[PDB]
């Protein structure tokens, strides 16, 4: 039965952190007078973890954007190559946004390039499809929600080749379709694009 | 503002893990983009990271059991000193309905 | 910027037991959290302990649990792993393992400085 007090406010530990925050301790260990055989505690309060501040921030890594639209697909001194048999190329852009502080940069190609066919406002063939999964409730949580679902005048693309040889490479490449056309259908219920129907929504809950 | 200061911010949970300190303010702890804070301690657990949208929530259960109903799932802006996507201050929820329909079985007993 | 440097191994039979002891650069012990590793003949790296900061929490692999005992001696820039009862499994090369952790009561299991190690070999 060693009757146990407090010992230093204590020797401080270095602050573990060259950036931001961090937690020393000292707090007051029970070593000056240690209880001994099991008699009486050290009465007060051991707890010393401190906040220690350092004044230079930390670095962040910077993270990727979403990625952009869809350039138009010209070919140089082709004049234009809509709605014909010319392959052409087209651009897409990112934007690495938030490093600070000598981070880390963005690992990756911020630019993405593919060849493409310039089906931009070309009439085409279509065909009617089929009713689509009905839509979400619009608009929600405000005055009468509805839903949506339509069939929409798909186009019939015409059969080009999908590839495309090189001059400098025997190897091939990809071609995608990019544009907006016009599709030509017979109508449906009085509507030459998109027929749709609305239903509204039984039961909506408060947001 | 004197904010509680914590060490980890537990993704997709939204849960502030790992206690720092209290009273430091929010400039001082979000020195470092892996802590979080939380103020009052009522709630909203905020990260120190950049003004992103968060993970959406699994769907409310189904306003009634019967027949065609309506479902909500929410989306809080999560971050600081910035805009979500949409001109968006940090703290503000979103919203989608979706219909749903539990059984189609109707007054059993 | 730590160093790290190992001793205590030794050839123990089986169910005799060992005490490991890991010396560190003094200047910069207490912003480490530390723990211990091990590596067999033929298997890949393997958590055994790990003490925080302040040596009040600590945390074992499931393997050395009730077995081992893992401490921190705070004022002798040395922590110690105390080995009982050991079996011929637990021939390995034990590393010490140093950490930066910013709570003074979180363990870890990712350590980004290590030693040379300490061979510590059982015999049935």
């Known amino acids: 039965g060693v009757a146990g007090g407090w010992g230093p406010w204590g020797p401080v530990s270095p602050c573990p952190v060259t950036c931001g925050l961090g937690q020393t301790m000292e707090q007051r260990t029970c070593n000056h007078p240690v209880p001994q055989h099991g008699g009486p505690f050290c009465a007060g309060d051991a707890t010393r973890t401190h906040i220690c501040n350092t004044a230079v921030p930390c670095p962040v890594d910077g993270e990727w954007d979403s990625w952009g639209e869809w350039s138009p697909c010209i070919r140089r001194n082709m004049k234009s190559i809509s709605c014909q048999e010319i392959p052409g190329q087209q651009s897409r852009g990112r934007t690495c946004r938030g490093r600070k502080f000598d981070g880390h940069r963005c690992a990756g190609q911020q630019q993405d390039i593919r060849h493409c066919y310039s089906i931009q406002h070309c009439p085409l063939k279509g065909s009617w499809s089929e009713w689509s999964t009905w839509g979400l409730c619009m608009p929600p949580c405000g005055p009468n929600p509805t839903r949506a679902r339509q069939r929409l005048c798909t186009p019939l693309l015409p059969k080009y080749p999908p590839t495309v040889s090189m001059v400098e490479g025997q190897g091939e490449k990809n071609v995608t379709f990019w544009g907006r056309p016009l599709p030509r259908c017979e109508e449906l219920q009085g509507q030459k694009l998109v027929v749709e129907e609305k239903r509204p929504c039984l039961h909506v809950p408060a947001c | 503002d004197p904010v509680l200061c914590f060490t980890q911010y537990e993704e997709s949970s939204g849960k502030c893990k790992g206690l720092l300190g209290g009273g430091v303010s929010v400039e001082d702890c979000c020195l470092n983009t892996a802590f979080a804070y939380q103020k009052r301690s009522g709630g909203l657990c905020q990260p120190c990271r950049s003004p992103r949208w968060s993970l959406w929530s699994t769907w409310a259960p189904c306003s009634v059991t019967c027949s065609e109903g309506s479902q909500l799932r929410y989306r809080r802006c999560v971050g600081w000193n910035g805009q979500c996507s949409g001109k968006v201050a940090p703290g503000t929820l979103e919203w989608q309905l979706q219909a749903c329909e539990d059984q189609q079985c109707c007054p059993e007993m | 910027q730590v160093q790290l440097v190992e001793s205590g191994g030794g050839l123990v039979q089986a169910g005799g037991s060992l005490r490991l002891s890991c010396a560190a650069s003094?200047?910069?012990?207490?912003?480490?959290?530390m723990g211990w590793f091990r590596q067999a003949p033929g298997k890949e790296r393997e958590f055994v302990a790990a003490?925080?900061?302040?040596?009040?929490?600590?945390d074992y692999a499931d393997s050395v649990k009730g077995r081992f005992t893992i401490s921190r001696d705070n004022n002798k820039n040395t922590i110690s792993l105390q080995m009982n009862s050991l079996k011929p499994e637990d021939t390995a090369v034990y590393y010490c393992?140093?950490?930066?952790?910013?709570?003074?009561?979180?363990?870890?299991?990712?350590?980004?400085?290590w030693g040379q190690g300490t061979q510590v070999t059982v015999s049935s």
């Open positions: 003094e200047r910069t012990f207490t912003i480490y959290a």
């Open positions: 393992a140093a950490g930066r952790a910013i709570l003074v009561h979180t363990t870890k299991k990712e350590y980004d400085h």
């Open positions: 003490i925080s900061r302040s040596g009040e929490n600590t």
